[PDB]
Amino acid sequence: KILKPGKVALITRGRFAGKKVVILQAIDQGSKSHPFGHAVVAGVERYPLKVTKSMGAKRIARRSRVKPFIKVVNYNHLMPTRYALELDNLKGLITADTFKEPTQRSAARKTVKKTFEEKYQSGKSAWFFTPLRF
Amino acid sequence: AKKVRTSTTFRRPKTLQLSRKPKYARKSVAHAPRLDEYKIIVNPINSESAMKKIEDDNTLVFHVHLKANKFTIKEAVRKLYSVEPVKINTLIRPNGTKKAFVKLSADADALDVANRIGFL
């Protein structure tokens, strides 16, 4: 039960390898479409760049923009992590129906993008928004 | 203000390198172009194989200078006979002279051009 909705984890397989994600909702039982212990996650595809005392608000905002992704990932391809990230905006928005409905997939991706904007700007989960150097 | 060295190496500083401004030119008169078209094209070839290339391949065969290359032969032919070649092949003969096969365009008739030169 270390993989719960709201736990931060790392992806080790696939295109988004080495990226930090938050478990949106766990399907540990499995599904007909995914006959394994998969879990939908939202992660940061492009981490925001570092900022400084200098640079105008334009450059700071330009470097603070974040590109997210949403993906169904196997448990064996996820690496769990002790840090936990939670927000009520990202509870229950994702499901199988969202993945089949591509407009909902894009809408959920944009909602995850926005939610990461306020979270980064507010300075929460600085580790989650820091890229991992491997 | 003591200058900070961060390399532990001293590398020779860059100083102004003036360009040459001679008080006199070493040569009074510049030489003329040593390889002009009249020296590039020596003679045409009128042997039986040369005629065969003229009447079928649309190709003119010339005795040319040793220092002449494909580019200079094309410019020399263009300026000396007003016909632009499409292809040039060169070989050094066993007698030490260079021979150039000059394939003319379909716009030009190698038979006619050979006639104007006079060796046909």
Binding site: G123 | R5, F10
Partner: peptide, 30 residues
């Protein structure tokens, strides 16, 4: 006081982060 700044200090001990550019004037091969 933007929280995005953070410190990120560098430690220049033996085996730690790369040594900073120092004055080496007393070691230069003159």
């Amino acid at each position: 006081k933007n929280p995005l700044f953070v410190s990120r200090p560098r430690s220049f001990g033996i085996g730690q982060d790369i040594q900073p550019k120092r004055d080496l004037s007393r070691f230069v091969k003159w």
